[model samples]
Target: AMVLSSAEEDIAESIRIILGTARGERVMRPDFGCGIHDRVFSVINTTTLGLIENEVKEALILWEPRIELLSVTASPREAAEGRLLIDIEYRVRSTNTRFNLVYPFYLKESA
Candidate 1:
């Protein structure tokens, strides 16, 4: 699993926005370092999409194993009543830096 330093709400939100745009209404996490391969940094980057890839990569590499993207299990046939199930177990850290790495994951539900 990956550990993040300088992880904050703002950082998380930006990452979420970036990932959401690509992955749709999927969940997000810090440096869980479980689902994605080679760390979540793979998805987070300074692309035209405005995602933070480099910052997050450096942070994760500092203290964590490489992230791997495992296949996701299928969701229930229907949504649970009154339950907004957002499954994303993420971590965060705080630091002093103008820029930070934000992992990205382009997820989309099957049709």
Candidate 2:
């Protein structure tokens, strides 16, 4: 409000909310969340990672229509097994302002 006329910060909040939500978690709007949450129990290998990649890609287009998704890349965290990182890079539709977000997902851990 005070700075950045395009309110890119606010846009970031919108994405953060979307990225953090699980589709089924919201009853009022079940279609308004990320697809990746559906597979938290699955193995975080290349195949699952690939699915998450496209999930982020399509979900952003489906839900976050205010931004143009430039890239959505999913990579495994070297230090943590069954944990993945989502690299979200996009530009604001109104101002073309870009921002990056890292959404982390962790699978079941055993002791």
Candidate 3:
């Protein structure tokens, strides 16, 4: 169901799992995934954005040991309908290879 990008299978799966899982979804380890999901409906502001950045970095650092975080930034998207653009950069600990990905998180208000 997935393509192999890295030679190390575990590393590839680790990244997949981290991004795929939502916080509070994992049994026994309630804080396993990124907390970004919790803020999907929050108002976009400087304070919330700061918290988002910190939470993302903290989640990765706490869960993923195979990669070291390089940077995480969140920006409000223009004309994008309550979406926040998040960019993440990290290095694979075993290979010291850097990788970056952008994730668009929707922050919409419930009707």
Per TM-score, the best of the predicted structures is: 2
The alpha-carbon lDDT assigned to residue 99 of candidate 1 equals 34
Please provide, for model 2 over 46-103, each residue's C-alpha lDDT reduced to its tens digit, 9 standing for 90 to 100: 7766788898888778877889988888877542665577888898888877889887
Judge candidate 3 at residue 43 and give its lDDT. Answer: 52
- Winning candidate number (lDDT): 2
Q: Number of clashing residue pairs in every model? A: 19, 0, 0
lDDT of 1 by residue, 1-111 (tens): 976553365555544443333222235635433222222332322251222333333333443322221211222223343211222334433333233332334343333
Query: Which pairs of residues have clashing backbones in candidate 3?
Result: none
Query: What ranges in model 1 sit over 4 Å off?
Result: 1-7, 23-85, 95-111
Question: How many angstroms is residue 97 displaced in model 2 relative to the true structure, after the best TM-score fit?
Answer: 1.9
Ranking by lDDT: 2, 3, 1
Off by over 4 Å in 3: 1-16, 39-42
Worst 10 residues of 1 by lDDT: 68-77
Candidate 3 weakest ten by summed lDDT: 6-15
Global lDDT of each candidate: 0.34, 0.76, 0.73
